[PDB]
Enzyme design. Structure first.
Site, mmCIF file in Angstrom:
data_model
loop_
_atom_site.group_PDB
_atom_site.id
_atom_site.type_symbol
_atom_site.label_atom_id
_atom_site.label_comp_id
_atom_site.label_asym_id
_atom_site.label_seq_id
_atom_site.Cartn_x
_atom_site.Cartn_y
_atom_site.Cartn_z
ATOM 1 N N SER A 75 3.517 3.019 8.162
ATOM 2 C CA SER A 75 3.230 2.045 7.093
ATOM 3 C C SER A 75 4.481 1.592 6.390
ATOM 4 O O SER A 75 5.312 2.415 5.999
ATOM 5 C CB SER A 75 2.376 2.710 6.016
ATOM 6 O OG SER A 75 1.051 2.837 6.421
ATOM 7 N N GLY A 76 4.569 0.281 6.168
ATOM 8 C CA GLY A 76 5.690 -0.287 5.439
ATOM 9 C C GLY A 76 6.924 -0.575 6.276
ATOM 10 O O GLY A 76 7.837 -1.281 5.818
ATOM 11 N N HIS B 28 0.827 -1.217 0.000
ATOM 12 C CA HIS B 28 0.000 0.000 0.000
ATOM 13 C C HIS B 28 0.871 1.282 0.000
ATOM 14 O O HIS B 28 0.341 2.375 -0.180
ATOM 15 C CB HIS B 28 -1.074 -0.021 1.098
ATOM 16 C CG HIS B 28 -0.570 0.351 2.457
ATOM 17 N ND1 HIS B 28 -0.219 -0.580 3.416
ATOM 18 C CD2 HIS B 28 -0.384 1.564 3.035
ATOM 19 C CE1 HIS B 28 0.167 0.040 4.516
ATOM 20 N NE2 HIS B 28 0.077 1.342 4.314
ATOM 21 N N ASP C 135 0.010 -7.650 1.704
ATOM 22 C CA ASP C 135 0.473 -6.261 1.710
ATOM 23 C C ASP C 135 1.987 -6.198 1.867
ATOM 24 O O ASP C 135 2.528 -5.886 2.949
ATOM 25 C CB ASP C 135 -0.224 -5.481 2.819
ATOM 26 C CG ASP C 135 0.005 -3.978 2.718
ATOM 27 O OD1 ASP C 135 0.516 -3.499 1.678
ATOM 28 O OD2 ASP C 135 -0.343 -3.278 3.700
ATOM 29 N N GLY D 141 1.860 6.779 8.578
ATOM 30 C CA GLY D 141 3.239 7.125 8.291
ATOM 31 C C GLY D 141 4.253 6.109 8.763
ATOM 32 O O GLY D 141 5.408 6.154 8.330
HETATM 33 C C1 LIG Z 1 -0.690 1.387 8.764
HETATM 34 C C2 LIG Z 1 -1.710 2.412 9.204
HETATM 35 N N1 LIG Z 1 -1.940 3.475 8.464
HETATM 36 C C3 LIG Z 1 -2.886 4.265 9.028
HETATM 37 C C4 LIG Z 1 -3.421 5.470 8.570
HETATM 38 F F1 LIG Z 1 -2.998 6.019 7.426
HETATM 39 C C5 LIG Z 1 -4.398 6.090 9.368
HETATM 40 C C6 LIG Z 1 -4.833 5.501 10.574
HETATM 41 BR BR1 LIG Z 1 -6.116 6.373 11.592
HETATM 42 C C7 LIG Z 1 -4.299 4.272 11.027
HETATM 43 C C8 LIG Z 1 -3.314 3.681 10.209
HETATM 44 C C9 LIG Z 1 -2.498 2.430 10.304
HETATM 45 C C10 LIG Z 1 -2.651 1.448 11.436
HETATM 46 C C11 LIG Z 1 -1.739 1.737 12.635
HETATM 47 N N2 LIG Z 1 -1.821 0.587 13.558
#
Ligand SMILES: Cc1[nH]c2c(F)cc(Br)cc2c1CCN
Ligand SMILES: [Ca+2]
Length: 223
Positions: free
Chosen positions: A177-178, A40, A84, A175
């Protein structure tokens, strides 16, 4: 990372920042030429930034290397986030040292209760928005499959696990993420998704890296 701590400069030497004008995702260095991240996080025009602490200041241990190729998992579904995971090849090999180092892939899957280190430059607030400059860290246990499925009925596949705290307060966030989830010196997870951050009964959900090791190895071998 919500409810975590300042890692300390270059103490997480496999942590990468993906930059396209700005930090937008984390990743993990798995050898001198390859980074693992979340599918993603895919976009074009990625520069991989290794050796980062403060992502807004050139502090002297960074290596900035453009991606030559990204490979999203062939079975990634962007609606469910199943599979993912993405691989990113660097245009030139990184120079490995104490502060820039690869993280080993798992040889077997991890168990509920295993302690892990999650890290990133994501949001530090569970309500509201504040983005840190330096790398943040969180120690968190893997949760049972049954707890994970109870938290997210109908959404947890065999390629996902939950980690964190059912009470809330400590979680990965936007943020992160990844980025890495490292347990006993192995990359077991990738920061994937969740419902909000650090909310009660909504722990973070992570890509189960051990299911992808064969694909990672054969991809690297031919690319
Ligand atoms: C990986 C990710 N990206 C998010 C995002 F962009 C917005 C929100 Br609110 C939560 C998340 C999470 C999960 C964190 N445990
Ligand atoms: Ca920096």
């Amino acid at each position: 990372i919500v409810g975590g701590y300042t890692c300390g400069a270059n103490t997480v030497p496999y942590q990468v920042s993906l930059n396209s004008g700005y930090h937008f995702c984390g990743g993990s260095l798995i050898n001198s030429q390859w980074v693992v991240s979340a599918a993603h996080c895919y976009k074009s025009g990625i520069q991989v930034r290794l050796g980062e602490d403060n992502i807004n200041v050139v502090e002297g241990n960074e290596q900035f290397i453009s991606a030559s190729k990204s490979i999203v998992h062939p079975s990634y579904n962007s609606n469910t986030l199943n599979n993912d995971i993405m691989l990113i090849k660097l245009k030139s090999a990184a120079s490995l040292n104490s502060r820039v180092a690869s993280i080993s892939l798992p040889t077997s899957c991890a168990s509920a209760g295993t302690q892990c280190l999650i890290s990133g430059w994501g949001n530090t607030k569970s309500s509201g928005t504040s983005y840190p400059d330096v790398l943040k860290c969180l120690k968190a246990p893997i949760l049972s499959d049954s707890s994970c499925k109870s938290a997210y009925p109908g959404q947890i596949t065999s390629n996902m696990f939950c980690a964190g705290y059912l009470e809330g307060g400590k979680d990965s966030c936007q943020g992160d993420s990844g980025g890495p989830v490292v347990c006993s010196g192995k990359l077991q997870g990738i920061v994937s998704w969740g419902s909000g951050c650090a909310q009660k009964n909504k722990p973070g959900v992570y890509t189960k890296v051990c299911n992808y090791v064969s694909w990672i190895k054969q991809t690297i071998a031919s690319n």
